[PDB]
Amino acid sequence: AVLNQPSSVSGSLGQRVSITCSGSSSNVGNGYVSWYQLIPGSAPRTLIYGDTSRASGVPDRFSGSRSGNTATLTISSLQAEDEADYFCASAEDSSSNAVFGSGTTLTVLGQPKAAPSVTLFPPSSEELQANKATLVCLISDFYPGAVTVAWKADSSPVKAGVETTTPSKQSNNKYAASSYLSLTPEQWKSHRSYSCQVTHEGSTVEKTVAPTEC
């Protein structure tokens, strides 16, 4: 029981963008569609209510419309802060029976490319004294949001103990990701070095730490 939205919508800065919301006569055909914006780390925000009315604080470039059982949210000129998930909604058979749309992820294109900054932290003395060891490879300030991460022990590939997060946006609208290598204190002390290597577009950055250097 969801209203049909496209899963993904993209546009470049300044371009026109429309998100559709197709239901039936029993929901959208009721004629009172609402729209909501979800930015990660923020609570949902009401954009449109009653097909076309804008909520408080919503910029004029957002407009809503409805043609029969299909409603449309339109951004007249895409701006960087519009990157978010968007949801339509409508009552059905009752004002207290709400159906939300399936959701649309809006990606705004056009921002400059940026090579990642990489910092590799060795296990802390506190963690080692607690019989654990975690190497932390933090990757920040890159665009586009796709990297490949590999680990080395000395010059040999690491085939176990690695966990890596999916890249997500920082507050400056660039991407960051993290990767962890879990080791025993013995494994850490027995090798001459460990490395985190990050590949982005046509470059690879490798950071190395060594137990003897600290």
Place this chain on the structure above:
Amino acid sequence: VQLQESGPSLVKPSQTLSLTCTTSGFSLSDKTVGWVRQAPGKALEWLGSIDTSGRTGYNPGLKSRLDITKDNPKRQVSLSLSSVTTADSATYYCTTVHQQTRKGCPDGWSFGWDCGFEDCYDDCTDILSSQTLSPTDTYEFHVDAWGQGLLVTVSSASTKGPSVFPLAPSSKSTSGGTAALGCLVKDYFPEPVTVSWNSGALTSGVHTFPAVLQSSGLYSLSSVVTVPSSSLGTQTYICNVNHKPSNTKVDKKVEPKSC
């Protein structure tokens, strides 16, 4: 208008999830309060509401497990969701909602009262051969104000507070004038954890990464901050980790290495 969700961060399968919304800045006899949730990677999902007359309405697909009550003097609204499974792990939002049922007649058709006199008529002049259609009710819904939301995890695994370790700056984390330092927040359950720096005084250049679910079933995350390299000898840096699911807060001073 304030909306504050409270309740457990972790519930076991088959148990009953019970949440409370404490409200301020309006009257529960003037505004209706609703519940919405969003499971990870899924769309927003309506739960139900209780209106200014005390009438409850629910999501039909979840009605068999839902109960919503309110206490007007205490300004609180309560939600109960029984027989939970992992599909019920979600962020639960308390909201104020616009709800209205409108009763009307189609285009051209008018009510018997409108035709010049409770049913819908086409020709107000030839009232003797006009058809009497019952009105079609339209329903208005939208969310007015949104609470911040409370993350709830359904699992048989047990709560675990985090261990916090420093990610200390050295010659290998400096980029000339700036240096990266951070905190590793290791082995906690369930989500979420929030991290501030220097009790919120330090905000520029901070990034807290999303957590990894390790093979052990425990989460870990990191938070990093970029600071002036010249400050490392004199300025103190403390990461403040909050794990509400375990009622734990940890402050950790991050000391620069002499290496």
